[PDB]
Write an enzyme that holds these catalytic residues in place. Structure first.
Site, PDB file in Angstrom:
ATOM      1  N   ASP A  85      22.234 -32.061 -37.096  1.00 22.58           N
ATOM      2  CA  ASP A  85      22.569 -30.673 -36.794  1.00 22.58           C
ATOM      3  C   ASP A  85      21.869 -29.711 -37.741  1.00 22.58           C
ATOM      4  OD1 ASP A  85      23.748 -28.374 -35.931  1.00 22.58           O
ATOM      5  OD2 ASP A  85      25.671 -28.723 -36.957  1.00 22.58           O
ATOM      6  N   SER A 129      11.166 -15.077 -32.960  1.00 18.21           N
ATOM      7  CA  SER A 129      10.265 -15.293 -31.836  1.00 18.21           C
ATOM      8  C   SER A 129       9.554 -13.990 -31.486  1.00 18.21           C
ATOM      9  CB  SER A 129      11.057 -15.819 -30.640  1.00 18.21           C
ATOM     10  OG  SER A 129      10.255 -15.889 -29.477  1.00 18.21           O
TER      11      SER A 129
HETATM   12  C1  LIG Z   1      30.605 -18.860 -28.656  1.00 18.88           C
HETATM   13  C2  LIG Z   1      29.727 -19.979 -29.225  1.00 18.88           C
HETATM   14  C3  LIG Z   1      29.337 -21.036 -28.402  1.00 18.88           C
HETATM   15  C4  LIG Z   1      28.534 -22.078 -28.892  1.00 18.88           C
HETATM   16  C5  LIG Z   1      28.154 -23.223 -27.928  1.00 18.88           C
HETATM   17  C6  LIG Z   1      28.122 -22.036 -30.238  1.00 18.88           C
HETATM   18  C7  LIG Z   1      27.280 -23.165 -30.782  1.00 18.88           C
HETATM   19  N1  LIG Z   1      27.665 -23.714 -31.856  1.00 18.88           N
HETATM   20  N2  LIG Z   1      26.993 -24.890 -32.270  1.00 18.88           N
HETATM   21  C8  LIG Z   1      27.203 -25.416 -33.476  1.00 18.88           C
HETATM   22  O1  LIG Z   1      27.973 -24.952 -34.305  1.00 18.88           O
HETATM   23  C9  LIG Z   1      26.424 -26.663 -33.781  1.00 18.88           C
HETATM   24  N3  LIG Z   1      25.403 -26.348 -34.826  1.00 18.88           N
HETATM   25  C10 LIG Z   1      27.361 -27.832 -34.160  1.00 18.88           C
HETATM   26  C11 LIG Z   1      28.520 -28.084 -33.221  1.00 18.88           C
HETATM   27  C12 LIG Z   1      29.604 -27.306 -32.942  1.00 18.88           C
HETATM   28  N4  LIG Z   1      30.406 -27.913 -32.077  1.00 18.88           N
HETATM   29  C13 LIG Z   1      29.904 -29.148 -31.771  1.00 18.88           C
HETATM   30  C14 LIG Z   1      30.416 -30.130 -30.906  1.00 18.88           C
HETATM   31  C15 LIG Z   1      29.686 -31.314 -30.780  1.00 18.88           C
HETATM   32  C16 LIG Z   1      28.472 -31.503 -31.478  1.00 18.88           C
HETATM   33  C17 LIG Z   1      27.954 -30.525 -32.335  1.00 18.88           C
HETATM   34  C18 LIG Z   1      28.697 -29.348 -32.450  1.00 18.88           C
HETATM   35  C19 LIG Z   1      28.521 -20.965 -31.079  1.00 18.88           C
HETATM   36  C20 LIG Z   1      28.107 -20.816 -32.562  1.00 18.88           C
HETATM   37  C21 LIG Z   1      29.324 -19.939 -30.551  1.00 18.88           C
END
Ligand SMILES: Cc1cc(C)c(/C=N/NC(=O)[C@@H](N)Cc2c[nH]c3ccccc23)c(C)c1
Length: 330
Positions: A35, A199
């Site tokens: 990650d 970007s």
């Molecule tokens: C409203 C919103 C929605 C999403 C999908 C994210 C992404 N977040 N992604 C992460 O934090 C990843 N770097 C790690 C991560 C978070 N949840 C997970 C579940 C499974 C595997 C990895 C992650 C955010 C920041 C805000």
């Protein structure tokens, strides 16, 4: 030194990628989600609340002759998607693809959120953002990359994620056979602890390129590409019947569609994401509404170049004194 490990999609949609990691002596192999958006190496363990484990492989520090409790240390992480995990900390020997770090902080989960419990294929996360984000208290810990860096042939790692196929994480070298053309490097800000870059713009399908600065993070741990609402609307306007659904939680489109590509700028270079990469399939089994792989970042507070974008490129995370990011087509 160097390391090289294969990374494998967890399912038919590339929802995440898992990479085998050896922890402890004798080795305990766990499949971790590398990650670049976080800085904690945490694992399901013998300490994890039993009702919150559903099929994951666990780390058992009592079975490792090299494990040592990091006395008094605790950790707790809240990801922006609403997921979370927390626990205590061991140091142990950790190897990735033949590259070994001794004394790595291995954060043992006592609690995890339901999202992690439900992901039976993900045994934990290996953070690759800057160590300033590490959540261990009262003594902040270094990432696997930061611990390895001085020993590496070159202070770099690379992400080469596959579309519906395995790919590779390399540490300490750039595989010049893994990409086409040249690598274009671009500046990174570490001010928020992320691999944050700008970007130079975008195009939708065969359309003209729009020169516009889009600040965002290179995040291997996020599935989708999250961009400003203006950009995302311009993309989905080219797909008949596409719409943003508050009930589903983003843009959906008719599963009968052929999606256009999406191009993003890296300096004067261009990375093309094929339309197929943007298809995340039916919103529920049997539905003819499909979930889009490009979504609005509005309300996240940062744009996120997640796997949808990164898997279209060979990506260099250059951890030299002044970090930079490199992108090549492949
Ligand atoms: C409203 C919103 C929605 C999403 C999908 C994210 C992404 N977040 N992604 C992460 O934090 C990843 N770097 C790690 C991560 C978070 N949840 C997970 C579940 C499974 C595997 C990895 C992650 C955010 C920041 C805000």
């Amino acid at each position: 030194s160097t390391g090289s490990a294969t990374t494998t999609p967890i399912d038919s949609l590339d929802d995440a990628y898992i990479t085998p990691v050896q922890i402890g002596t004798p080795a305990q192999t766990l499949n971790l989600d590398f990650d670049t958006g976080s800085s904690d190496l945490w694992v399901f363990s013998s300490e994890t609340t039993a009702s919150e484990v559903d099929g994951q492989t666990i780390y058992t520090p009592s079975k490792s002759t090299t494990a040592k409790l990091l006395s008094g240390a605790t950790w707790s992480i809240s990801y922006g998607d609403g997921s979370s995990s927390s626990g205590d900390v061991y140091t142990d020997t950790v190897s990735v693809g033949g590259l070994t770090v001794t004394g790595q902080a291995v954060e043992s989960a006592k609690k995890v959120s339901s999202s992690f419990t439900e992901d039976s294929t993900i045994d934990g996360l290996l953070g690759l953002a800057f160590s300033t984000l590490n959540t261990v208290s009262p003594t902040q810990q270094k990432t696997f990359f930061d611990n390895a860096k001085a020993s590496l042939d070159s202070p770099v790692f690379t992400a080469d994620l596959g579309y519906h196929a395995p790919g590779t994480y390399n540490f300490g070298f750039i595989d010049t056979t893994a990409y086409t053309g040249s690598i274009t490097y671009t500046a990174v800000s570490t001010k928020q602890g992320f691999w944050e870059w700008t970007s130079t713009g975008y195009a939708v399908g065969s359309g003209t390129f729009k020169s516009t600065s889009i600040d965002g993070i290179a995040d291997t741990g996020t599935t989708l590409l999250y961009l400003p609402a203006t950009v995302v609307s311009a993309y989905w306007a080219q797909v008949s019947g596409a719409k943003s659904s508050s009930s589903v939680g983003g843009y959906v489109f008719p599963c009968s569609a052929t999606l256009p590509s999406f191009t993003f700028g890296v300096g004067s270079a261009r990375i093309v994401i094929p339309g197929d990469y943007i298809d995340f399939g039916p919103i529920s089994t049997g539905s003819s509404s499909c979930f889009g792989g490009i979504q609005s970042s509005a309300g996240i507070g940062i744009n996120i170049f997640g796997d949808v974008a990164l898997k279209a490129a060979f990506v260099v995370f250059n951890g030299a004194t002044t970090p930079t990011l490199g992108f090549a087509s492949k």
